[PDB]
mmCIF file of C-alpha atoms in Angstrom:
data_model
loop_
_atom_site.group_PDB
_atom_site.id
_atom_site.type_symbol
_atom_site.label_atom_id
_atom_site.label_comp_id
_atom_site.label_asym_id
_atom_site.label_seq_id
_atom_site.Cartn_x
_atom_site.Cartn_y
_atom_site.Cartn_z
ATOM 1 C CA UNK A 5 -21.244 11.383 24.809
ATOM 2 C CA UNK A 6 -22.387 9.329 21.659
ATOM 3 C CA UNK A 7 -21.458 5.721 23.694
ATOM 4 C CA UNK A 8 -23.607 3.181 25.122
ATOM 5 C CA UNK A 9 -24.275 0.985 21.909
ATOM 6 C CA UNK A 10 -24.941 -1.879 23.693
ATOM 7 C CA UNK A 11 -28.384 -1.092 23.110
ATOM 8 C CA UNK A 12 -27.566 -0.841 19.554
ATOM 9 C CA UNK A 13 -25.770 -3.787 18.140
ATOM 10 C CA UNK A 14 -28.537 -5.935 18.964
ATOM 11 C CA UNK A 15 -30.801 -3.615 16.515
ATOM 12 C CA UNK A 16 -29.961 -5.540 13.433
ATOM 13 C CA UNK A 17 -30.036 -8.806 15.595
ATOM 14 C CA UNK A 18 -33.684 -7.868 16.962
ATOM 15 C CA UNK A 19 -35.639 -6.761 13.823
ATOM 16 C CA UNK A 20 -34.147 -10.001 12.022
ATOM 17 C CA UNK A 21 -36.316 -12.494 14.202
ATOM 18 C CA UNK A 22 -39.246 -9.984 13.646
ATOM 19 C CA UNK A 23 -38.684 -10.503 9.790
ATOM 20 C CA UNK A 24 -38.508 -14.279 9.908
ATOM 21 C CA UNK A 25 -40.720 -14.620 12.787
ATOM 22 C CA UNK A 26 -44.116 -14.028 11.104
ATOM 23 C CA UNK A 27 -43.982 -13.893 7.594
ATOM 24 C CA UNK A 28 -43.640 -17.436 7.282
ATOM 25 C CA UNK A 29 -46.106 -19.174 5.469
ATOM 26 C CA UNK A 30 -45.056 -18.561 1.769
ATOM 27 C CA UNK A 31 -41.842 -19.841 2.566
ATOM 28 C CA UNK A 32 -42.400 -23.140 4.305
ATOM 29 C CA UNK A 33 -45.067 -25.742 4.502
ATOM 30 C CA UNK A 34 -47.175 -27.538 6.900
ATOM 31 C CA UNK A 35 -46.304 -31.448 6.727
ATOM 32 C CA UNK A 36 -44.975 -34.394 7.295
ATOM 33 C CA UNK A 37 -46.087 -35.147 10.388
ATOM 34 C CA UNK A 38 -43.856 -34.433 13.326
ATOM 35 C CA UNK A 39 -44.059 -37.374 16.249
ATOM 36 C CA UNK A 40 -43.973 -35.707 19.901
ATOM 37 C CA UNK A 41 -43.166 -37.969 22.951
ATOM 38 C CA UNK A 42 -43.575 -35.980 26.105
ATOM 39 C CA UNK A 43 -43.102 -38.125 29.060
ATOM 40 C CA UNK A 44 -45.666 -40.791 30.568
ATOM 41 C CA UNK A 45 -46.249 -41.584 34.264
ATOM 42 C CA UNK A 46 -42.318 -42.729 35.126
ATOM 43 C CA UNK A 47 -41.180 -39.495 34.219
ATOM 44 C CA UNK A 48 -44.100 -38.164 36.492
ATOM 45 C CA UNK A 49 -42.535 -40.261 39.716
ATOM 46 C CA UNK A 50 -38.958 -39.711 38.821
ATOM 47 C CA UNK A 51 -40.529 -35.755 39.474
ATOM 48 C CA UNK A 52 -41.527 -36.375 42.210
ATOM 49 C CA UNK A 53 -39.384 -39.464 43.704
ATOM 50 C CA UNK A 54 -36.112 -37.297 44.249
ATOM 51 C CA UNK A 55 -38.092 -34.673 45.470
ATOM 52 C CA UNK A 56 -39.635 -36.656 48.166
ATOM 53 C CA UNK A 57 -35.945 -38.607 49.074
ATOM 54 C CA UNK A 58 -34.603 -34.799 49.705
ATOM 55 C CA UNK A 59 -36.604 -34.535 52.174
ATOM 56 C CA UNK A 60 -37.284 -38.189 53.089
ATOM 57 C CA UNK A 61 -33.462 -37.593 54.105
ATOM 58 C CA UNK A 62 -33.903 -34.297 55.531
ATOM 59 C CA UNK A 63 -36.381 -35.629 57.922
ATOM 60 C CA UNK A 64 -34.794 -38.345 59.045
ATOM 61 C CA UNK A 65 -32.027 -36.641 60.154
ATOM 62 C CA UNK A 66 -34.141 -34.182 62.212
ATOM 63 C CA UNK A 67 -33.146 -36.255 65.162
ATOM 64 C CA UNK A 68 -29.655 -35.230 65.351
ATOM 65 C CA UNK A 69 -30.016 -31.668 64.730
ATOM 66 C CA UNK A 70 -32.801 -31.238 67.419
ATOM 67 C CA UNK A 71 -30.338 -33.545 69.483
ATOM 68 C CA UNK A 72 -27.934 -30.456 69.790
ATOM 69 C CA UNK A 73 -31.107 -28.093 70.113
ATOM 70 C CA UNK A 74 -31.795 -29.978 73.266
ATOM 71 C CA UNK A 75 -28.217 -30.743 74.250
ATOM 72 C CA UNK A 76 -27.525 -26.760 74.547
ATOM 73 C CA UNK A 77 -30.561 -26.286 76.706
ATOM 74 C CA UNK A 78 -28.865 -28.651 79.451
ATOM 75 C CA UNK A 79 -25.510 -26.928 78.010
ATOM 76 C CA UNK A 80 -27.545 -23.638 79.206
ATOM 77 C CA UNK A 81 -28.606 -25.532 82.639
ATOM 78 C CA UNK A 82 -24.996 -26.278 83.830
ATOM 79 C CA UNK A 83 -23.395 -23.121 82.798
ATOM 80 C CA UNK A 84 -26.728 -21.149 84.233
ATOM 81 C CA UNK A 85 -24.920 -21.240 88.344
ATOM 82 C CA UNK A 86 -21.914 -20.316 86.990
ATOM 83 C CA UNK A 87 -23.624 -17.132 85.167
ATOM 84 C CA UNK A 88 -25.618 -16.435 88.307
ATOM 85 C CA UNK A 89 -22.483 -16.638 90.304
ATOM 86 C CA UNK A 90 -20.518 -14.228 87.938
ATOM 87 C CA UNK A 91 -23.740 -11.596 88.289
ATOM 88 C CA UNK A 92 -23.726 -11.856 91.432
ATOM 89 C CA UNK A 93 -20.026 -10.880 92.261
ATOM 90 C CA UNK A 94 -20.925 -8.171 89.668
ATOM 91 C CA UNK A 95 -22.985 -5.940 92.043
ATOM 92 C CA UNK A 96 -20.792 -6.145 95.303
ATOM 93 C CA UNK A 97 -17.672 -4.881 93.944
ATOM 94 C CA UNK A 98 -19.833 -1.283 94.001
ATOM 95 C CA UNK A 99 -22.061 -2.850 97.027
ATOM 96 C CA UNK A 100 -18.806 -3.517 98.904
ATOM 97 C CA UNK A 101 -17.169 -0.195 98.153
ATOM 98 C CA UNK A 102 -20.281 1.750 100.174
ATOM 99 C CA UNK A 103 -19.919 -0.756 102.910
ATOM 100 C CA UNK A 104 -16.334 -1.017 104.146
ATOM 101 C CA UNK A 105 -14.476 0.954 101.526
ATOM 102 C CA UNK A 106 -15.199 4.314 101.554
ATOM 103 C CA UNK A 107 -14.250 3.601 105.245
ATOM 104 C CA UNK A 108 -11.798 1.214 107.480
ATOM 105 C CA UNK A 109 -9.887 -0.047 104.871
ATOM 106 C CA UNK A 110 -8.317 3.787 103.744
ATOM 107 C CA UNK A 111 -8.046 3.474 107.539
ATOM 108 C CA UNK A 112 -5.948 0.322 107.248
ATOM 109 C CA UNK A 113 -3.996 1.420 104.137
ATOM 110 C CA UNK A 114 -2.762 4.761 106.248
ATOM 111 C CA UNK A 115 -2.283 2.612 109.310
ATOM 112 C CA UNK A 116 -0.469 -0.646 107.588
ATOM 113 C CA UNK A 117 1.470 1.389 105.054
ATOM 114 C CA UNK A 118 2.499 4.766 106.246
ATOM 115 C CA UNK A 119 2.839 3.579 109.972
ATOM 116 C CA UNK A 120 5.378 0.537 109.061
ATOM 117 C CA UNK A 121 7.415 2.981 106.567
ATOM 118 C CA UNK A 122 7.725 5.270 109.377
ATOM 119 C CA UNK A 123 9.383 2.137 111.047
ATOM 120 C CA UNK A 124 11.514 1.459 108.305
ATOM 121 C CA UNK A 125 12.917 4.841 107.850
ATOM 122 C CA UNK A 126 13.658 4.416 111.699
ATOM 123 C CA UNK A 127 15.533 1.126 110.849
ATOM 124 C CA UNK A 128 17.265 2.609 108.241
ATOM 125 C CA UNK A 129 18.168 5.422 110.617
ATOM 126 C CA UNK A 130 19.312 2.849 113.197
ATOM 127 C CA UNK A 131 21.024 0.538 110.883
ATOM 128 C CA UNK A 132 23.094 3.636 109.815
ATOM 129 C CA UNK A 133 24.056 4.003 113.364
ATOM 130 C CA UNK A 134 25.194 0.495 113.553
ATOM 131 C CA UNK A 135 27.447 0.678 110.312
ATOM 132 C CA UNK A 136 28.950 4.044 112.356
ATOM 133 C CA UNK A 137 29.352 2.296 115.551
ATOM 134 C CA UNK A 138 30.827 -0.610 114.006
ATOM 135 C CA UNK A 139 33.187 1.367 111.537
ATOM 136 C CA UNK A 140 34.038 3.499 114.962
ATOM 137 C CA UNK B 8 -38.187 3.434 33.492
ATOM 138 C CA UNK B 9 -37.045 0.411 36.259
ATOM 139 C CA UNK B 10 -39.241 -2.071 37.125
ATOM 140 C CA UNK B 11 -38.670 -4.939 38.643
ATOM 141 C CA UNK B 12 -42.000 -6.272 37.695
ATOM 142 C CA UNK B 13 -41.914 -10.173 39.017
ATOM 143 C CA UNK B 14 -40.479 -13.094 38.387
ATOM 144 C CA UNK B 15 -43.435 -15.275 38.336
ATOM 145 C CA UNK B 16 -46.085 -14.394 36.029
ATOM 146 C CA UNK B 17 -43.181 -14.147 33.361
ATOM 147 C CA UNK B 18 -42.378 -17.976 33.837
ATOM 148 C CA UNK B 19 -45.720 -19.396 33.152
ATOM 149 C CA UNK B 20 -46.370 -17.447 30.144
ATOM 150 C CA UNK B 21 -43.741 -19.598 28.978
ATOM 151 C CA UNK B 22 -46.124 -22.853 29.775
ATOM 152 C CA UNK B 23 -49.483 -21.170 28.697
ATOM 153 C CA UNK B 24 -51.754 -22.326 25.941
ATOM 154 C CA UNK B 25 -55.378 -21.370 25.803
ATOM 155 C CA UNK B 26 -56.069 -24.341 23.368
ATOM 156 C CA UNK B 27 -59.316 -23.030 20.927
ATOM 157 C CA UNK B 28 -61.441 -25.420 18.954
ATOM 158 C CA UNK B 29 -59.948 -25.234 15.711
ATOM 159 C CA UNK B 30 -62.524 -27.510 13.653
ATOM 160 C CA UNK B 31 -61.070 -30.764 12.041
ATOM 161 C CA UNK B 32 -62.262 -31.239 8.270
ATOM 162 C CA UNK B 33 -61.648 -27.432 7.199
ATOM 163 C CA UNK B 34 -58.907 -25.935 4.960
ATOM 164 C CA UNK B 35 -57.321 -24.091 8.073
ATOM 165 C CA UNK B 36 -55.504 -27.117 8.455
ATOM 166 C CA UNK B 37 -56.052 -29.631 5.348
ATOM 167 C CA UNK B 38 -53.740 -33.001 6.373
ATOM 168 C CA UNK B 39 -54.197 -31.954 10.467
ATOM 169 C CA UNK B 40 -50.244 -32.967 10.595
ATOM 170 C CA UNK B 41 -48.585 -31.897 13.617
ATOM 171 C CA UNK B 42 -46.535 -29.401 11.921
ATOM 172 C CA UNK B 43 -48.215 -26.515 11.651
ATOM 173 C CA UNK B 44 -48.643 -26.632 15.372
ATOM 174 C CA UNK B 45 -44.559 -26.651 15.642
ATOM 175 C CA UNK B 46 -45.043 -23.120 13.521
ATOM 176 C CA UNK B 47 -47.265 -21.280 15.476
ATOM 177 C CA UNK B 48 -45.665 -22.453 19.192
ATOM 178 C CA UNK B 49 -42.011 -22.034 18.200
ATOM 179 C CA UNK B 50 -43.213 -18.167 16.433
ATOM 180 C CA UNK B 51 -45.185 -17.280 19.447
ATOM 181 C CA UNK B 52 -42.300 -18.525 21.748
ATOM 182 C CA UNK B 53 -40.000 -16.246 20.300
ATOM 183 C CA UNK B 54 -41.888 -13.123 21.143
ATOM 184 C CA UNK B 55 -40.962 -12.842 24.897
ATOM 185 C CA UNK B 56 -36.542 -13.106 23.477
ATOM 186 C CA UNK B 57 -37.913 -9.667 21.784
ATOM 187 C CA UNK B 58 -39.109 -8.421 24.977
ATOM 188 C CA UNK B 59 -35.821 -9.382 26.882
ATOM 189 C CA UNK B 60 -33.695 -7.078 24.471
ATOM 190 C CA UNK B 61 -36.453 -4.044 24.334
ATOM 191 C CA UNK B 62 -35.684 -4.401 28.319
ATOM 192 C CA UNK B 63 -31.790 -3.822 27.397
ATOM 193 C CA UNK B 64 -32.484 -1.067 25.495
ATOM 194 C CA UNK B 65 -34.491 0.194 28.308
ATOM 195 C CA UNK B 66 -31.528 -0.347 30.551
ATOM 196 C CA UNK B 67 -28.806 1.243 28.631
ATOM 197 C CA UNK B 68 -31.012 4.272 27.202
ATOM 198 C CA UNK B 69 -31.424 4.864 31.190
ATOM 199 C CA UNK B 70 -27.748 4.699 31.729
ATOM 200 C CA UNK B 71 -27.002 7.344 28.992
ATOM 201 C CA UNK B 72 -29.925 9.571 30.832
ATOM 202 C CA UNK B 73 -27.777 8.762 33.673
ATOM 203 C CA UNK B 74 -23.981 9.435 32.427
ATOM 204 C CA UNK B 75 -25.766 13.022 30.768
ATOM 205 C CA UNK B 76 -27.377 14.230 33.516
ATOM 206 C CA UNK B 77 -24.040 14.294 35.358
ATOM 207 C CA UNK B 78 -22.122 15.993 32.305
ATOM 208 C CA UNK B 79 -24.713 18.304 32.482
ATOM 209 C CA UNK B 80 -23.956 18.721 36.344
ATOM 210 C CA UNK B 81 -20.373 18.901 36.042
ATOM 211 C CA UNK B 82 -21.039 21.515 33.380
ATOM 212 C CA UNK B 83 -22.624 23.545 36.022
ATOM 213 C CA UNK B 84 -20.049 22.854 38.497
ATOM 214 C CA UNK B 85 -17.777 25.903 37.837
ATOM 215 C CA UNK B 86 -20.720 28.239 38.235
ATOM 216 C CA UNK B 87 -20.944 26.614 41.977
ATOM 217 C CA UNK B 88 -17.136 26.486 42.512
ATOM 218 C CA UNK B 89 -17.220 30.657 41.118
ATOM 219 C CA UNK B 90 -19.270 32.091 44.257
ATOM 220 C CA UNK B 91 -18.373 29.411 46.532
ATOM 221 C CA UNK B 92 -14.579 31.346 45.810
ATOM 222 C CA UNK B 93 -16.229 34.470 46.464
ATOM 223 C CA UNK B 94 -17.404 33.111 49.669
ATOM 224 C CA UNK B 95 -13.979 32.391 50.476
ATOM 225 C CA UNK B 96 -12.587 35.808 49.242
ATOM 226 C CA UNK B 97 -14.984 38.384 51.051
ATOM 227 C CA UNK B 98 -14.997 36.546 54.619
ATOM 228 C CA UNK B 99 -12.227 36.742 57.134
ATOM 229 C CA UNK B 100 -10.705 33.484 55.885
ATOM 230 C CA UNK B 101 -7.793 35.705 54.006
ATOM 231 C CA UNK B 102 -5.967 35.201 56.945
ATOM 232 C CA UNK B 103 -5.483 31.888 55.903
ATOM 233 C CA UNK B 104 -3.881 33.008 52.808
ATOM 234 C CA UNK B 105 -2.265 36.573 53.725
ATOM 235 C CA UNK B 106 -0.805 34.924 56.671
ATOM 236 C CA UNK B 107 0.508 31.287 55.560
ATOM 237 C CA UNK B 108 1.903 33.545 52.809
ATOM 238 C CA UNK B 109 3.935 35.947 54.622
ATOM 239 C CA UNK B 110 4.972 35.428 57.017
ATOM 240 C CA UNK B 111 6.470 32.044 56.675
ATOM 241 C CA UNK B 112 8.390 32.424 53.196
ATOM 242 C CA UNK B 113 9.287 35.908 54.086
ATOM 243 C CA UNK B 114 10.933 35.146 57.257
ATOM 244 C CA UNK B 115 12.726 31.475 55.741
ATOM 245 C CA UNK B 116 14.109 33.901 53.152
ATOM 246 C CA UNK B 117 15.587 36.421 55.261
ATOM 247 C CA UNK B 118 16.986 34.183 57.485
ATOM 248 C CA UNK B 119 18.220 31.919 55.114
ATOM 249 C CA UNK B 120 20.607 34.521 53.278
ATOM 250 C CA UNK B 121 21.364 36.120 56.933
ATOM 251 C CA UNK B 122 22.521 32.467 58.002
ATOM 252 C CA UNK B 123 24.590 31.798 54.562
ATOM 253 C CA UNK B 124 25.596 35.509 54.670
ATOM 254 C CA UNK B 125 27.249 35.166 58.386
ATOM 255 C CA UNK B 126 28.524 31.748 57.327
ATOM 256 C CA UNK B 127 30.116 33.470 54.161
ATOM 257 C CA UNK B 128 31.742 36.239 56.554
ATOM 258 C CA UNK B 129 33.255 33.908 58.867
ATOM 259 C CA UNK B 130 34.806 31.932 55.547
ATOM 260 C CA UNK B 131 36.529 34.735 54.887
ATOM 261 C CA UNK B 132 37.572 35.640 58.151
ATOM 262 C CA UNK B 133 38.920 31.953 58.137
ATOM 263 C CA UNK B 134 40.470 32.477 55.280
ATOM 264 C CA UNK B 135 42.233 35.524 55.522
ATOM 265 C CA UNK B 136 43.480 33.989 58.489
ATOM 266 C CA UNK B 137 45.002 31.260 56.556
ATOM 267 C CA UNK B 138 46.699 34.142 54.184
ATOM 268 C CA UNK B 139 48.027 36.460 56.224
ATOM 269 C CA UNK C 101 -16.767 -13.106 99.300
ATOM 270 C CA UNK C 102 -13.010 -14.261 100.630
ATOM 271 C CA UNK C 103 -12.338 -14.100 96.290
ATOM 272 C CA UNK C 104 -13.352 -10.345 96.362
ATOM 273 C CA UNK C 105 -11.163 -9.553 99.265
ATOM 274 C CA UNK C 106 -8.358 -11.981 97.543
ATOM 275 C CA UNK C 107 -8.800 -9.296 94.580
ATOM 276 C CA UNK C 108 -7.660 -6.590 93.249
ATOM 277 C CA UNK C 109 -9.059 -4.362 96.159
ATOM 278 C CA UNK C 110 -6.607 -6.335 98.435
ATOM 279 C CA UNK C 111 -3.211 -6.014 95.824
ATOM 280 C CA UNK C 112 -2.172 -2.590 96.932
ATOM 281 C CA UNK C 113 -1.187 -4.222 100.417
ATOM 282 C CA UNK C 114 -0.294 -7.571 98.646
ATOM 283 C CA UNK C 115 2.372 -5.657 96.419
ATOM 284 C CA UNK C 116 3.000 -3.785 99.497
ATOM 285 C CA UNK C 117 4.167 -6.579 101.195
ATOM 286 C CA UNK C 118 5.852 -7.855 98.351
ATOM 287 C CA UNK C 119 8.009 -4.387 97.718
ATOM 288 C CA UNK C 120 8.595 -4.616 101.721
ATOM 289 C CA UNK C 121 10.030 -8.095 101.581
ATOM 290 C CA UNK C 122 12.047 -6.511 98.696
ATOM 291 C CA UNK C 123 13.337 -3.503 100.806
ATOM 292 C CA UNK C 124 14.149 -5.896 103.354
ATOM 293 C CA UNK C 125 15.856 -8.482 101.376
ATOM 294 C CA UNK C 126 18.011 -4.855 100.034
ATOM 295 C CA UNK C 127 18.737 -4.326 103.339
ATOM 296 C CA UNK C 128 20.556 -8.412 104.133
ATOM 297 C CA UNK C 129 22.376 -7.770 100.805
ATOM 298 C CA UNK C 130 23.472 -4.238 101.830
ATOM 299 C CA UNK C 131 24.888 -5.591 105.072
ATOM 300 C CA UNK C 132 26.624 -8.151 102.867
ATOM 301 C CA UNK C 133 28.190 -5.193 100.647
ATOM 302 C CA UNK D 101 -24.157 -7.946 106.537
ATOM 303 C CA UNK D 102 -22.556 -9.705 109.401
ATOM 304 C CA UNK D 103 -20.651 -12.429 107.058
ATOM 305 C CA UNK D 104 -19.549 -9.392 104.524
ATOM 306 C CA UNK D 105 -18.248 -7.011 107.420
ATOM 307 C CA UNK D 106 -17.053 -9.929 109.793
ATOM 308 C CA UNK D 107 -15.422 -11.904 107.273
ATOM 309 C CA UNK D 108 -13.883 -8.934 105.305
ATOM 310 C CA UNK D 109 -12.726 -7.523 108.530
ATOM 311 C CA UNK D 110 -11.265 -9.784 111.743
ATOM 312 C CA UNK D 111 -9.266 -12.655 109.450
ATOM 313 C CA UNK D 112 -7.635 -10.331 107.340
ATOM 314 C CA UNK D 113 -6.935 -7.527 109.270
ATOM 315 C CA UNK D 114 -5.313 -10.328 112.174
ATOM 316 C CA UNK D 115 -3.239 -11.904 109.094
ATOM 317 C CA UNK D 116 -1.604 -8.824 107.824
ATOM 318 C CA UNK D 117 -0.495 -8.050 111.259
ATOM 319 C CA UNK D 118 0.802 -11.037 112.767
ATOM 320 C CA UNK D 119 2.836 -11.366 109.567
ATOM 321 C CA UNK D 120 4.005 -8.253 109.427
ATOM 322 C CA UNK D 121 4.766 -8.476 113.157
ATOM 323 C CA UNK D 122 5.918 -11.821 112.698
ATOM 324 C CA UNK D 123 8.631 -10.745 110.301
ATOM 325 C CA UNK D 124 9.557 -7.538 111.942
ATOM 326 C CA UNK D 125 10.499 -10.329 115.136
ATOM 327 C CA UNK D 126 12.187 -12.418 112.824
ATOM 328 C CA UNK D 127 13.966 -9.651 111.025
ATOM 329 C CA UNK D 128 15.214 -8.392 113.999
ATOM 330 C CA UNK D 129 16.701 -11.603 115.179
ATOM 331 C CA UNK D 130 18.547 -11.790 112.335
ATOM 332 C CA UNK D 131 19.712 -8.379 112.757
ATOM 333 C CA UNK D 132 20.491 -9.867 117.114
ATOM 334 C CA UNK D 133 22.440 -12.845 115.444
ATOM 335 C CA UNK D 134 23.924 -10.852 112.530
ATOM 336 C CA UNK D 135 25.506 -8.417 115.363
ATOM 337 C CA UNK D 136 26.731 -11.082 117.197
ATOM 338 C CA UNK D 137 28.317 -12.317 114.131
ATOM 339 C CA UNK D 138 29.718 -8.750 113.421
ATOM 340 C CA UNK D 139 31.174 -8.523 116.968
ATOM 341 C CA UNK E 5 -32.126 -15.041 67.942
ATOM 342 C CA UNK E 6 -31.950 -15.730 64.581
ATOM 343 C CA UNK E 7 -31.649 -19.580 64.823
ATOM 344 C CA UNK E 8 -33.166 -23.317 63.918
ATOM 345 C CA UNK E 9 -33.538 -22.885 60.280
ATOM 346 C CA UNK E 10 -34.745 -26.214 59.969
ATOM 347 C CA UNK E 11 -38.349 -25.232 59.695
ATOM 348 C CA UNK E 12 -36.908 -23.159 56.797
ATOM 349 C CA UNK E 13 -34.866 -25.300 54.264
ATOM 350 C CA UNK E 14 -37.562 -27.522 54.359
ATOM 351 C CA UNK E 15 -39.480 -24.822 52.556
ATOM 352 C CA UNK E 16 -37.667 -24.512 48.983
ATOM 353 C CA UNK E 17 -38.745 -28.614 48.905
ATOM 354 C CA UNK E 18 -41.744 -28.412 50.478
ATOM 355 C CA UNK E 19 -43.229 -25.726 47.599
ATOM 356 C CA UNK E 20 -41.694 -27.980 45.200
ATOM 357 C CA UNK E 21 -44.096 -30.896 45.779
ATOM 358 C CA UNK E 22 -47.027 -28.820 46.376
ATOM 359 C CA UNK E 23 -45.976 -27.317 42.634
ATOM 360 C CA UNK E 24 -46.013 -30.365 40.901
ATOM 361 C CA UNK E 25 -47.970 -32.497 42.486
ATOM 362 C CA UNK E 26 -51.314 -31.046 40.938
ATOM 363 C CA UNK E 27 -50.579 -28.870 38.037
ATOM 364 C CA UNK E 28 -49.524 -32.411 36.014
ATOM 365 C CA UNK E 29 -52.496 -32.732 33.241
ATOM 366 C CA UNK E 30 -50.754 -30.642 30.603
ATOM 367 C CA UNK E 31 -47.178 -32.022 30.967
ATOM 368 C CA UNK E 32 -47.995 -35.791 30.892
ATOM 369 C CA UNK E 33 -50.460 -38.022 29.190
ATOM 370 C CA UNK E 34 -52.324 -41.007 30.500
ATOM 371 C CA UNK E 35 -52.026 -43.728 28.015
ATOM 372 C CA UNK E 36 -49.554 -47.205 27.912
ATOM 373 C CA UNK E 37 -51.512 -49.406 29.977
ATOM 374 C CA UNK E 38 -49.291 -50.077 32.785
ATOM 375 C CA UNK E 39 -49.697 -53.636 34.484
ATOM 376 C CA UNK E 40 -50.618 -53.831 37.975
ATOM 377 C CA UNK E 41 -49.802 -57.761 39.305
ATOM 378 C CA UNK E 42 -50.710 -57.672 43.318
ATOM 379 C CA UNK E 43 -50.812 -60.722 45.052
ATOM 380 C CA UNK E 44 -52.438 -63.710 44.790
ATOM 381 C CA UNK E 45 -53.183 -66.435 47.445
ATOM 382 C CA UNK E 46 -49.891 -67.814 48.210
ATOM 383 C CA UNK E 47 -49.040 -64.623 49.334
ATOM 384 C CA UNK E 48 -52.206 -64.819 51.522
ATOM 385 C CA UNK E 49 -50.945 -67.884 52.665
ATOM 386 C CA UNK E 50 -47.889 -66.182 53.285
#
């Protein structure tokens, strides 16, 4: 499409200031003496005086900063047991399972579950005998 | 045409003088004032706020290169979706569109008219009931 | 090693126990119905 | 080993029956006394 | 990790100096005679 003149409407704003940027000197003239003031030795140390308070400040409070770099390390120390403990019961709940588990203890669920339901259905068997013999 | 040149030997071009010995006591500059030296830094400062908007042309002559080259691609784009039909036409993937188009309508038709047929039939069986 | 028995692995028999109390507490209210 | 399989095994294993059979006792002299209430 | 960037904002203030601190002599001008008045005996004595 024919769009995009962006690059276009600054065409008669960009050859101007190549008209009147060099073909001065018959239109003008070269006098009267301009002063110029450009900035002695206090405007050299305000330069560099806030620039040395930023970091005269920035510095100075280095002490707080590395205060919490070295009150996490002895954050670290005091939760380190606590992580060692937590790794630790990490390994034996498979270390455990070789041990005793694939073993004695599917031996104790079928003996202390199926076992003592065998007794209850024998209660309940009973204690329907007892609501016959009473209601007899 | 996109480069990013760098941003810092642009910025002291903007604070660079090579100072040359112009002589004093010559016609080049006949009173010395300090005017002509206003001339020739503003003049030569305003050559790098020419440069700046040749780089917007650059940018927006790349954008139309980029906004034609797809027209030009969406041109072609029939010519790709033309044999990419014909690879859907002479595979077995008809039986998308034989199929979903059968059997579906074919049999909703039929039994919708059998349905409001029978339902019709038994209106009039009603009804005659309610005559007679 | 006494938490790892106290867990999980234990709470089949510890819901066990707890659904057996249950039963048995069904039972004292079905001799009240 | 002998904590893991020691520990794991005797204390536990003792507790879950002498509850159990501690109940089932208790259970059925409530079911003696309930009788005798019936009666 | 990616941490203690204190070393590191230091840095945008740390060029700055080093920029201009020697690159001064066409910016200024060394004229105006400033007065310098240090200390005499009675702060000696002091």
């Amino acid at each position: 499409e024919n769009d995009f003149k962006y690059f276009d409407d600054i065409r008669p704003f960009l050859d101007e200031i190549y008209k009147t940027r060099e073909r001065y000197t018959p239109f003008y003239d070269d006098r009267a003496d301009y002063n110029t003031n450009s900035k002695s030795y206090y405007d050299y140390i305000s330069r560099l005086s806030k620039l040395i308070e930023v970091l005269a400040r920035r510095i100075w409070d280095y002490d707080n900063e590395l205060k919490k770099r070295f009150k996490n390390w002895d954050d670290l120390m005091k939760a380190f047991p606590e992580q060692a403990k937590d790794l630790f019961r990490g390994w034996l709940n498979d270390g455990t399972i070789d041990s005793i588990i694939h073993d004695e203890f599917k031996k104790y669920s079928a003996g202390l579950t199926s076992a003592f339901a065998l007794f209850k259905v024998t209660e309940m068997k009973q204690m329907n005998d007892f609501k016959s013999e009473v209601k007899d």
